[PDB]
Amino acid sequence: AAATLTSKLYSLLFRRTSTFALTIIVGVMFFERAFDQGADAIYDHINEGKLWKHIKHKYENK
Amino acid sequence: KGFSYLVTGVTTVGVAYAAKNAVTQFVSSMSASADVLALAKIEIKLSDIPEGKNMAFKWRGKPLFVRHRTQKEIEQEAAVELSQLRDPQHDLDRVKKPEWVILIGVCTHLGCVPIANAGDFGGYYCPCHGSHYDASGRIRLGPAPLNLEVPTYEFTSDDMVIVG
Amino acid sequence: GCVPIANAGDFGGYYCPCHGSHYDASGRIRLGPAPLNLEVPTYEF
Amino acid sequence: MTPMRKTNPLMKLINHSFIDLPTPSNISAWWNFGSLLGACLILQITTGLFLAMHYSPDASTAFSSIAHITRDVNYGWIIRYLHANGASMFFICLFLHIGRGLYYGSFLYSETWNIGIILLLATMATAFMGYVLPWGQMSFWGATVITNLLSAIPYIGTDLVQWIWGGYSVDSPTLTRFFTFHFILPFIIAALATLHLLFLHETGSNNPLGITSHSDKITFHPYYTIKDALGLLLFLLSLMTLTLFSPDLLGDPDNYTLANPLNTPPHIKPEWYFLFAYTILRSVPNKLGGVLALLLSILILAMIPILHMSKQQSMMFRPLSQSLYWLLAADLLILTWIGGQPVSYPFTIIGQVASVLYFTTILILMPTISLIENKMLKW
Amino acid sequence: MTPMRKTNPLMKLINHSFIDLPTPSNISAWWNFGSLLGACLILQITTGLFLAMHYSPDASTAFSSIAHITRDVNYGWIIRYLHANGASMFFICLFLHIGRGLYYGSFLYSETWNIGIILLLATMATAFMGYVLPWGQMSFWGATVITNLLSAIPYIGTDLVQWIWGGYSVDSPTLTRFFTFHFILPFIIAALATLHLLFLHETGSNNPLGITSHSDKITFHPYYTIKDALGLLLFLLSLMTLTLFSPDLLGDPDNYTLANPLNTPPHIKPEWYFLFAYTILRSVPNKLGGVLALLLSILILAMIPILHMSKQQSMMFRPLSQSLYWLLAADLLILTWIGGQPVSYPFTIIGQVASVLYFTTILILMPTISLIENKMLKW
Amino acid sequence: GREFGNLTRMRHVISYSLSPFEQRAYPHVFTKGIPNVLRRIRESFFRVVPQFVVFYLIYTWGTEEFERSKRKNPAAYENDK
Amino acid sequence: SDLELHPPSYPWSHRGLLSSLDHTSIRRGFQVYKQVCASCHSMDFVAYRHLVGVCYTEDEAKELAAEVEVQDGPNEDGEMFMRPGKLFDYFPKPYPNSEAARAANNGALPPDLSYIVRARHGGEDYVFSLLTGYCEPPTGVSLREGLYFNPYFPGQAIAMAPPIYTDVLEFDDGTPATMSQIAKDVCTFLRWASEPEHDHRKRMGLKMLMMMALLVPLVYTIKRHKWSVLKSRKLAYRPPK
Amino acid sequence: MFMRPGKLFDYFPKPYPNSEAARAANNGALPPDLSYIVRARHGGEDYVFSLLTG
Ligand SMILES: COC1=C(OC)C(=O)C(C/C=C(/C)CC/C=C(\C)CC/C=C(\C)CC/C=C(\C)CC/C=C(/C)CC/C=C(\C)CC/C=C(\C)CC/C=C(/C)CC/C=C(\C)CCC=C(C)C)=C(C)C1=O
Ligand SMILES: COC1=C(OC)C(=O)C(C/C=C(\C)CC/C=C(/C)CC/C=C(\C)CC/C=C(\C)CC/C=C(/C)CC/C=C(\C)CC/C=C(/C)CC/C=C(\C)CC/C=C(\C)CCC=C(C)C)=C(C)C1=O
Ligand SMILES: COC1=C(OC)C(=O)C(C/C=C(\C)CC/C=C(/C)CC/C=C(\C)CC/C=C(\C)CC/C=C(\C)CC/C=C(\C)CC/C=C(\C)CC/C=C(\C)CC/C=C(\C)CCC=C(C)C)=C(C)C1=O
Ligand code: HEC
Ligand code: HEM
Ligand code: HEM
Ligand code: HEM
Ligand code: HEM
Ligand code: FES
Ligand code: FES
Known about the structure:
Family (chain G): Belongs to the cytochrome c family.
Transmembrane segments (chain G): 198-231
Order of helices and strands of chain A: HH
Radius of gyration of chain D: 23 Å
Organism (chain G): Homo sapiens
Largest sheet of chain D: 2 strands, antiparallel
Strand content of chain A: under 5%
Number of helices of chain D: 13
Number of helices of chain A: 2
Strand content of chain D: under 5%
Distance between the termini of chain A: 66 Å
Radius of gyration of chain A: 21 Å
Number of strands of chain D: 2
Largest interface: D-G, 28 and 28 residues
Shape of chain D: globular
Structural class of chain D: mainly alpha
Number of strands of chain A: 0
Shape of chain A: elongated
Order of helices and strands of chain D: HEHHHHHHHEHHHHH
Oligomer: part of a larger assembly
Keywords (chain G): Disease variant, Electron transport, Heme, Iron, Membrane, Metal-binding, Mitochondrion, Mitochondrion inner membrane, Phosphoprotein, Primary mitochondrial disease, Respiratory chain, Transit peptide, Translocase, Transmembrane, Transmembrane helix, Transport
Distance between the termini of chain D: 55 Å
Cofactor (chain G): heme c
Bound molecules: ubiquinone-10, heme C, protoporphyrin IX containing FE, FE2/S2 (inorganic) cluster
Helix content of chain A: 55-70%
Strand order of the largest sheet of chain D: 1-2
């Protein structure tokens, strides 16, 4: 019987276009960090040992 | 309605993300090539320069003077007046270590190269008109509106000085 | 593009050190993998 | 109180062309490439402008300049690849933009159709002079061959070639003028494109059926904006996949070796989009014959409207014409494939057969079958 | 059959824009400098285009290429001087274009007047970047000074000056980057020039009297085509005299020396057409304040329509406003003269007085006198 | 003729439509969509495909004949002896 | 003469659509280049930088650059001298001019290796097969005394003597030196030298794929949403009778 | 690199290879190139003539 999640998201945010834009840009701010970090982790996990940042240990600090 | 507008709202997020990235690429291409950075700011220099000696270097196409100077030469700097300049500047406000002086190697009068360890002040001597300067290079005889340029340098290790 | 040798060739013409290809004085194909004869814009002497 | 987009002069033009443009509702994807072409142009322009800030149009430093762009300029490699790969996409859309008109009978719009022919020739010139800019082996020699093709003129000949070259051969002066011409023409194409759209608006777009669409016209802002915004997304998807996964697939090596006036590679084949005409040239032993063939090729497009004989626009309702169309397309594929292969017995004969088949189909078969179909319909 | 010029799409625009648009019969020669400007723009493109076929934008080969053009290239010297002197003629016509508007009240056409301001700013940018291309002693230092004057921006200045430089100095990357901008910008100006005419055409041209001339309009073609042709002939006369007899009077020597980074010339000065602004910034003691003055000035041109408070459009019947207008013209002459003189006590005070007099005239004196004149006539 | 106000003259026609928010964006995309696509493909299969098959056959044979030509000739060496 | 033997497709570690380049291989590949290759082949478009973030650290690169000697600009009131070399000098060329190189190599000119991989068909696959497979000529063919047979060369005759055999060098890593091993490392290093944006290019590709997967269905949904009103429209014709 | 006798297309020989050698032999002063000296200095040849005579 609880009001659907989308209905609440609409009345508070989507009804007013200015708030609709505000939530969009904040979502971009957050999604950018999340998407970037996730993609980078996947790429590194595909190529452990190949990437030089995983090789620094064998030779570092003289 | 909330469902449909959600789709649109999410779509814009994606369009925004790429948009920013794309622009940052094109703008970054204009900032500076890697070679520019490699050739510039790379001015590590040993501290082994004796007192009074002036080993010439190059920096941004400008000859650069780094001089260790004895205490009596610094006393001679005190003899010269920092209030007798068009742009007065207190001594320690110029040089972080009075025994060290880093300055440009071109005179501002006609682009001539001053002679190190010369002049009536014991500093620099321009043969083009016999202009005299001190170890700090304070404009004394010349049209230069202000003193000789004080290049930006930063001490990181006791033996190196970054200049960039 | 190898330069023919002066006063060379098995027939008094030119000799190519790159592959041993021989060319006559007139540059005609006589030996060697060269597809066409030596290209000179004008046979003016 | 009334809308402000119906008073301001700058908004009247945008309203006419973009927002309240009456457009048929049943137009398929084939009608999207038009927009994409302009979009691709807008991309090329910007991409090239950024490459111009670091390119030295000199025969002794052009090749080194590109090497410096891809190794020292921030994101220079991607910009260069986007420009190169975006040119191939231009032609792909352009060939599909011309095929639609051939199939659906859009050539009946004389004015618009003729403007397109000019646009095609202008774009072809732009791509040829751009490809010589890198100053690779293929670039140097490709220009030489194509430029020596004007010597076939009866009495002038050499004069034009030496005039274009600015000398007795291809060297720095040729490179510099080509750089300037490469820079300028795209902006001229933009003006031609506006004339293209100008003459189009007087009549409107042609629906796939070929019947008058005045009963089912809809506005352009809400429907075809999103439909053409989805097409552009797909266009970018294809372009980015090509650039980011196969940067050198539609190109050719030997462009990464410095141009040598003395050495010459064996195959020396031109770019893929300039291959069908290349085979047509080689099919005719005579030089004058070949150049006339190349020109006669493009001219056919201008003559196609005159060769139309059927009483219908679209070939959707004429299956025999459809089969001929697809055979003609396959012939073009054969021409392209032959252009990519060395000169040998089987390829040479196949090229000659393809060339004659090409011309005969357009000039003879299509009008004849059109009349035949008119007979079976008791017109 | 009716004339084709009223039915063909391309001919409708030409007929409206040139052949048949009504124009006032009494417009004087002042109304002839608008057409000349475009002609000069056309002249500036073609000449520059040919120069681009031989110029090499590099720190080392730029000066050499100019010498090569002047001596070895056929008729290179005349082309270069037409380009150089055409620039000065362009600004002379441009100032006269602006002056006419201020005197006869043309600024009342807000939409058209505002677009004009953009054209002026773009023109100045094109001219400033072009002056760097020769890469002489004056070009190097002129760019250095006029660029280092963005370090005064509150917090981003230093970041936005190195970015423009492409480095920590002014070197070849700046030269190539300016070259591309120099090429592209004029074509944008051409497009904007079509918006200028477009917004003008929806209202019609003004006349010296300031009264509407609907009663006595005339077709543009016969009368004004020949009149503008006469103006073009006179404009060519002036240009050819400058180039063919005394090409270098209006230039500044010492630009014929190779740019020496470690040699500051004793007397750095901008070009004659930019001097008026130089003195307005050199006078203000604060570096940032001087930039704010050079900008607030140019923009008072945008504020002129607001400050207008007279009940008559044309200053022809306003004798006191005429005296102020000529006084302001004299002030601009003084500013120009001071710009070319070294820093010293007499010139500095004269420049300071001229700057304040310039501003106060535009702001206070002109509105107040217009109000008094209105009071005199008993409106 | 170029303005929606006056394009054609129609009469005795009615139309019915629903709002975008009152209907599904993918209605019968499992039971009625796929079969329609299959109809489209089948209805134009023989008009296009077979010609491009001929192209493939011409392409394969060609390559085969080209390579077949470079093979050495045993009939040019039997007598060479 | 005869159609050149096409090299086979080898299983490189970066053949995959999303794979990268093993950076330890590049390190050993460069080590090979430092002496065995640089005798007459040259890399005109590489500097001692470009390696700081790839294989070697800052300090090790600087120390390595100190081992070379370049010629510096004219001394003021003097002439040219010799400078140690810093991290902005490109790799030393072996000969002042092409003609001198030809003289020392029986007229053959060793091409620059900066773009060799992208220059030749087959890429590194071609180079690997080329470095190996130095067999003797079959029965019925003769060669100039200063040429060597190689079935992968388009003419089968090449002036390159076999450059790599076993135990020519000694890796500091401890990896045994084997003709196959050295060839693999140098081929990887060359593939990098012709494409140092390899890893970055593929990372951006990965992000592009995921972004398209999210976007394409979304944009299509919006298109269907707006167009639904037209796709469901129903029409009727009711003349006066 | 060998030395030719010289041809028409050749330019006038350089007195010195580099500016450093020129100044070293001219007591620090660098003699400017004369190809554009007339149009570079103020006063034209009037300056040059009076310069040599005075
Ligand atoms: C002494 O050394 C110096 C010199 O010498 C050496 C100099 O030379 C200079 C001069 C500087 C010179 C080069 C450098 C300065 C360069 C610049 C400011 C500009 C920077 C930009 C350039 C290269 C790029 C130029 C930009 C271009 C092409 C972009 C524009 C593109 C377009 C199509 C134009 C489109 C515009 C469109 C649609 C808008 C349409 C409408 C309008 C005009 C209408 C007006 C609208 C309005 C609100 C205004 C109306 C207002 C009203 C009523 C209110 C009144 C206003 C008030 C203000 C009161 C300096 C400073 C100097 O130090
Ligand atoms: C007072 O009342 C008035 C008004 O108010 C009622 C008005 O309103 C107006 C109208 C206002 C005005 C003019 C003012 C300005 C306003 C305007 C609208 C116009 C704006 C201007 C413009 C866009 C600029 C227009 C153009 C200019 C300079 C020209 C630049 C562009 C070009 C095409 C020009 C041509 C350059 C050419 C040909 C190059 C020269 C070289 C040629 C021979 C050699 C060329 C060779 C080649 C391309 C070779 C190619 C070879 C190839 C591919 C090789 C092929 C090889 C094979 C083998 C096939 C007026 C006048 C008026 O008075
Ligand atoms: C299918 O149905 C459809 C139809 O049919 C029914 C249709 O009909 C249409 C109709 C529409 C079309 C097809 C659309 C396309 C239509 C066309 C004709 C195509 C037209 C294309 C174009 C004009 C090309 C557009 C792009 C162009 C020219 C390039 C754009 C970019 C630029 C000039 C550069 C912009 C700036 C950039 C990158 C920023 C970098 C630079 C800088 C900051 C500048 C640096 C500084 C300087 C210059 C310095 C200036 C200041 C200086 C010196 C000093 C200042 C002062 C100081 C004091 C320092 C559609 C869509 C459709 O779908
Ligand atoms: C050390 C491993 C090594 C690699 C990898 C290498 N070189 Fe070469 N290389 C040449 C010469 C000369 C050519 C041109 C023709 C030839 O191969 O003989 C050439 C050609 C090549 C080619 C192919 C040329 C073409 O046109 O396809 C490659 C690839 C190459 N070198 C890379 C002298 C050398 C020398 C000097 C003794 C050495 C050492 C040498 N080469 C060692 C190496
Ligand atoms: C080269 C750049 C070109 C651009 C930017 C361009 C632009 C456009 C655009 C945006 C459309 C509208 C698309 C539509 O409504 O279907 C269009 C239509 C058209 N184009 Fe082009 N075009 C170009 C080249 C060509 C060429 C080479 C031809 C060759 C004949 C051509 C012929 C046509 C025709 C006939 C139409 C009308 C189609 C119809 O009415 O259905 N165009 N063009
Ligand atoms: C329809 C418009 C255009 C087309 C079809 C086109 C096509 C091309 C092509 C195919 C190349 C060679 C790509 C390669 O060798 O990999 C090229 C090169 C180039 N083009 Fe254009 N171009 C266009 C517009 C422009 C514009 C407006 C500019 C403005 C500066 C420009 C500047 C350049 C430059 C600088 C290069 C050098 C490429 C390089 O250095 O790698 N192009 N162009
Ligand atoms: C820079 C290139 C420019 C071109 C090619 C151009 C062109 C023209 C032309 C052809 C006319 C009509 C004929 C004439 O007045 O002589 C005109 C009128 C006008 N121009 Fe410009 N113009 C330019 C710049 C400017 C600028 C910088 C302004 C600054 C105020 C301006 C303001 C005006 C005004 C207010 C009119 C209306 C004249 C009237 O109503 O009588 N224009 N322009
Ligand atoms: C209104 C348009 C233009 C103006 C006001 C303008 C102005 C100038 C100016 C003042 C110079 C300095 C020349 C000197 O001091 O000797 C110059 C140089 C140059 N401009 Fe233009 N220009 C315009 C259009 C163009 C165009 C369209 C091009 C090329 C397409 C071009 C190419 C050049 C070149 C190559 C130079 C170097 C000439 C030299 O160094 O003497 N310009 N321009
Ligand atoms: S050179 Fe310094 S005062 Fe003359
Ligand atoms: S080099 Fe001439 S035949 Fe090989």
